[PDB]
């Protein structure tokens, strides 16, 4: 049945709760972003109101074929009324169109649901600065101290430099980047830019990217693989077998592949620095795994919460085991005792 952490008390609202059929007493279903664990259940046959960002509404329409009459897009950073309740959507620093939602309850309670986010100090100067938050529904994906990773800027630096070097040494090398969902577009766009190429991809992926309001996008992407020296492929094809097969398809235009697998966190983050990462190699193929995260590190999460000083925290990730739950509750207590709220 719908879990309690997907219901907003004092309203007929749910968040990211599309796989439980009709939720008894829900008058509006909010969708924070277009990732499949979040939208799971939505289809062309859904007949309840969906509230979301403009970009998310472009994807629901074009990729899922949800009918237009049920899609309610809202602008960001704007006080809006939904079934009699004031709401604000804020940028989540996750994937394109990902939002956090502020609900202002009739009784005076204020609730923030982060959706999926990567906390940033820039958030401390949004509409959040303006008033108190009583309850926080938090993206706890990486809520443990061992989860460190570099900034997005440092990871892109490493990728740009690595690709630029390889292709300058061998102009017959192809660069390939793995994808399976929206998000992490900076990886393949930054690399294409340093190489003066457009990025080539399948028609289905091109379509997806045309929904995202990325400026000058037509100058940056294409469906003509031949004209482009950066190719996107399904993440599942980013292995030696899949890459050889793909090189075969390029008709002797290239004699080397350098590939990037953007992951979240991996255990090598505990020991190794970004400067020191090395690829997996077999023959004329090299695969780099790069830790490009669109979720809060442990420290970034802690800073955000200690700044906000909520009265109650409700985790939305890793809630399935008692040991996880107990571990998170310990950190919330440390944070609260350290900062004095
Ligand atoms: Ni997500």
UniProtKB/Swiss-Prot annotation:
Reported induction? During mitosis. The mRNA encoding this protein contains an internal ribosome entry site (IRES) in its 5'-UTR. This 5'-UTR generally suppresses translation while specifically promoting expression during mitosis, when cap-dependent translation may be impaired.
Name the major location.
nucleus
Q: Which domain of life is it from?
A: Eukaryota
The positions making up the signal sequence are none
Provide a GO biological process annotation.
interstrand cross-link repair
Record's subcellular location: Nucleus
Can you list the GO cellular component terms from the UniProt entry? Answer: fibrillar center; nucleoplasm
Provide this UniProt record's keywords sorted from A to Z.
Answer: Cell cycle, Cell division, DNA damage, DNA repair, Hydrolase, Isopeptide bond, Metal-binding, Mitosis, Nucleus, Phosphoprotein, Ubl conjugation, Zinc, Zinc-finger
Tissue and organ distribution: Expressed in brain, heart, kidney, liver, pancreas, placenta and skeletal muscle.
Molecular function (Gene Ontology), one example: damaged DNA binding
Q: Which family does it belong to?
A: Belongs to the DNA repair metallo-beta-lactamase (DRMBL) family.
Quaternary structure annotation from Swiss-Prot or TrEMBL: Binds constitutively to TP53BP1. Binds CDC27, which is itself a component of the anaphase promoting complex (APC). Binds PIAS1.
Protein function: May be required for DNA interstrand cross-link repair. Also required for checkpoint mediated cell cycle arrest in early prophase in response to mitotic spindle poisons. Possesses beta-lactamase activity, catalyzing the hydrolysis of penicillin G and nitrocefin. Exhibits no activity towards other beta-lactam antibiotic classes including cephalosporins (cefotaxime) and carbapenems (imipenem).
Q: Can you say what this protein is called? A: DNA cross-link repair 1A protein
